[PDB]
Design a protein around this ligand. Sequence first.
Ligand SMILES: N[C@@H](Cc1c[nH]c2ccccc12)C(=O)O
Ligand SMILES: N[C@@H](Cc1c[nH]c2ccccc12)C(=O)O
Ligand SMILES: N[C@@H](Cc1c[nH]c2ccccc12)C(=O)O
Ligand SMILES: N[C@@H](Cc1c[nH]c2ccccc12)C(=O)O
Ligand SMILES: N[C@@H](Cc1c[nH]c2ccccc12)C(=O)O
Ligand SMILES: N[C@@H](Cc1c[nH]c2ccccc12)C(=O)O
Ligand SMILES: N[C@@H](Cc1c[nH]c2ccccc12)C(=O)O
Ligand SMILES: N[C@@H](Cc1c[nH]c2ccccc12)C(=O)O
Ligand SMILES: N[C@@H](Cc1c[nH]c2ccccc12)C(=O)O
Ligand SMILES: N[C@@H](Cc1c[nH]c2ccccc12)C(=O)O
Ligand SMILES: N[C@@H](Cc1c[nH]c2ccccc12)C(=O)O
Lengths: 67, 68, 69, 68, 69, 69, 68, 68, 68, 69, 68
Amino acid sequence: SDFVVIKALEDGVNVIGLTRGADTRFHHSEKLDKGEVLIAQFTEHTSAIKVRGKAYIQTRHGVIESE
Amino acid sequence: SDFVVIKALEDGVNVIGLTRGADTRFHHSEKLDKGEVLIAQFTEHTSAIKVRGKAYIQTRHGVIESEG
Amino acid sequence: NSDFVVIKALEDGVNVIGLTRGADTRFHHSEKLDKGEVLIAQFTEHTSAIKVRGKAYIQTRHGVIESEG
Amino acid sequence: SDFVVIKALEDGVNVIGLTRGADTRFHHSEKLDKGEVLIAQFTEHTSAIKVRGKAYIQTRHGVIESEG
Amino acid sequence: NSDFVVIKALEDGVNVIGLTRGADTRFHHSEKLDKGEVLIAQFTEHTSAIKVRGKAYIQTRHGVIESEG
Amino acid sequence: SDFVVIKALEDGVNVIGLTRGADTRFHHSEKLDKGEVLIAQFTEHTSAIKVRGKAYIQTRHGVIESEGK
Amino acid sequence: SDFVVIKALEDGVNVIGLTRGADTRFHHSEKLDKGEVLIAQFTEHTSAIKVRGKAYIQTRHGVIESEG
Amino acid sequence: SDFVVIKALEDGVNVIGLTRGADTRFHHSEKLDKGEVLIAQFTEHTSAIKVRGKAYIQTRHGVIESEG
Amino acid sequence: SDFVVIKALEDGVNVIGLTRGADTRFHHSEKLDKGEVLIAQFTEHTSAIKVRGKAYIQTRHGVIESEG
Amino acid sequence: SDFVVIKALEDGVNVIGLTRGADTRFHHSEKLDKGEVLIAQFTEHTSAIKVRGKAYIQTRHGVIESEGK
Amino acid sequence: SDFVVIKALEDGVNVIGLTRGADTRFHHSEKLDKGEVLIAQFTEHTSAIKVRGKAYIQTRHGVIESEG
Ligand SMILES: N[C@@H](Cc1c[nH]c2ccccc12)C(=O)O
Ligand SMILES: N[C@@H](Cc1c[nH]c2ccccc12)C(=O)O
Ligand SMILES: N[C@@H](Cc1c[nH]c2ccccc12)C(=O)O
Ligand SMILES: N[C@@H](Cc1c[nH]c2ccccc12)C(=O)O
Ligand SMILES: N[C@@H](Cc1c[nH]c2ccccc12)C(=O)O
Ligand SMILES: N[C@@H](Cc1c[nH]c2ccccc12)C(=O)O
Ligand SMILES: N[C@@H](Cc1c[nH]c2ccccc12)C(=O)O
Ligand SMILES: N[C@@H](Cc1c[nH]c2ccccc12)C(=O)O
Ligand SMILES: N[C@@H](Cc1c[nH]c2ccccc12)C(=O)O
Ligand SMILES: N[C@@H](Cc1c[nH]c2ccccc12)C(=O)O
Ligand SMILES: N[C@@H](Cc1c[nH]c2ccccc12)C(=O)O
């Protein structure tokens, strides 16, 4: 199953997981401080991922940056 | 399953999931504020995704941009 | 796990039309896009062909093609 | 499962689906007007596709053009 | 999910002949193409070999080849 | 499943299927005259293919030529 | 299943496994000292990994560096 | 499933199929005259193939040439 | 499964397997002397591998070096 | 399943298949003379292959050459 | 399933299988003299392979050389 790499470029970045299934809501928000990296898969419980805050992101489709 | 990356280039962008199945309707709209990124899969419940508003989108077939 | 098509409307009133899978072929849904909206649409248990009408920039795994209104 | 892209270069381009199975005949003809695009899969019901008329065609093996 | 061949007729009366899969081998269908028409034909449960007669431009996963009439 | 493309470069080329299994024998010989093309799979019944006669051959390993008699 | 390579560039780097499932929490934190390498899979129990401290990281998507 | 192409560079090239299983011996020998081509798979009954005589051979790992 | 190559660049390099499962602990420590090479899979019992000591390592993701 | 290509570069080359399982021993030694090519798979019964004698070898990882005593 | 190629560069090189399973111990040591080549899979019984002595090694990750 595929994954996303997120590197926080500032304190307070949120990596938020969205529920798989008929309904869509946030079930977890992981806080990243500056320089921390999270590598996060899609899973049985998480079919969409939202990033809030400034971070460097890598996926299979290349690099993108949130602000 | 494939996924799409959507980065909102202005406030109020909507990423809209359309129902899988014989019926087609919107089941969810995720609102993105400028500079937020959403990475969203195709799923048992979502077989088409629509984006409204200004955004930079990546998929397996390359970059495309939506404009508001 | 199926393939998908990206459609970006280059004018108002673009229609992305889904054709039914199976022995019966007909249109079952027509999605209206206005200028600059994007639809990323899979082939599905219900949709085995997709017709685009109106001016649009389309990406498939075979590359770019453009429809003209 | 594979698909063919068909872009009509004139009115009345006919995309013809041939039946899968021991018998071969057409079971559907989808006409396209100039500039419309049809992205059609091979399926449980369609194992061969014929294009009549002027059309620009993409498949996994590259581009080909039909002449009407 | 089988492979498919692309056949473009370069003259009228090209024949794309499907041969039967299985222990026995015979022609089960000849699809006749006129000049400029394109047939995209899979290998299937019933067709394990395809013969082209007449002048045609052909694409398969191993490249381009041309039949001559 | 893999296939081979055979284009006859003279009359009377044979494309010969050998039986799959513990027994090996020819079960079919498809005659090609000049300019005809056969695109033939490996199958539940054919696990080896012999070409006799002058032909241009494509497989997934590239181009090979058989030389006639 | 995919894996991530982490080389500690300073002492006390923490590679933290997050639980797979409805619940998300840290179930393990592996401490690396300077110059140690950990190569770590996604698994039945671990569906996200977090690195804290200065490290050089390789994944399928290329190289990235965490900072302390 | 993999296959090899064998082109005979002289008369009487011998393509030898070795039996798959705990035992090894040849179960079939197909002779090729000069210029003939055999395209042969690995199968339930053949798990090694030997070529005797001058032949031009292609496999997934490139070209090799047997000499008589 | 994926495997890692580890070449000891000094004596007493440790290639340590961490248990797969809810619990994470060392189950095995393989000591390599200078110049020895260990080629080691991920497996039913081993879902993370830690290298301590100076070594040259290859993974699908490319080269990395652990240092003493 | 993977296979290795072995071309003998002198008489008397041996390609030795080692048994798959908890037990490791030689179950078969195929003797090759100069110029002959063996294309051998890994199988239910053979999980390692040893080559003794001068030979030119291809595998998915590239060319390697065995040298005889 | 993958394999590794080992060419011995001097006499008495040892290619050592380590047991798959909860337990890790040797199980078999194949001695290669100079110039001999062994091509060995990962298997139900072997999940790690050690090379001791001077040898040229190829894996899917490239060339590496052990030193005695
Ligand atoms: N609960 C939704 C979440 C989702 C995934 N991808 C989306 C795309 C758009 C909107 C919502 C989603 C689902 O599993 O289908
Ligand atoms: N409910 C439709 C939604 C859909 C997916 N792709 C489409 C293409 C065109 C029109 C509708 C769609 C389906 O699951 O098949
Ligand atoms: N209902 C038809 C639709 C179709 C798909 N590809 C086509 C090509 C030509 C004509 C019809 C089709 C099918 O599922 O087979
Ligand atoms: N009914 C035929 C259609 C077909 C597919 N490919 C062909 C090639 C030649 C002739 C007919 C065909 C089949 O399913 O096999
Ligand atoms: N009925 C034969 C047709 C065939 C396929 N490929 C061939 C190659 C040679 C001769 C015959 C064939 C089969 O299914 O096997
Ligand atoms: N009956 C043999 C035919 C064959 C395939 N590949 C071969 C290679 C050599 C000799 C015979 C063969 C089989 O299916 O195994
Ligand atoms: N017992 C843990 C080991 C592990 C794998 N990857 C990790 C990443 C971080 C922390 C622990 C791990 C598991 O199988 O999941
Ligand atoms: N327990 C969560 C952990 C997780 C994986 N990826 C995520 C992305 C965002 C938030 C949480 C996660 C899950 O398995 O789904
Ligand atoms: N009967 C043997 C034939 C064989 C395949 N590859 C080999 C390598 C070496 C020696 C014999 C073999 C087997 O199926 O395993
Ligand atoms: N019987 C052993 C053969 C073997 C394969 N790979 C090896 C590597 C080293 C030593 C022995 C082996 C096994 O199947 O596992
Ligand atoms: N018996 C161990 C062998 C092993 C494979 N990879 C390793 C890495 C480190 C330590 C031991 C191992 C296992 O099957 O898991």
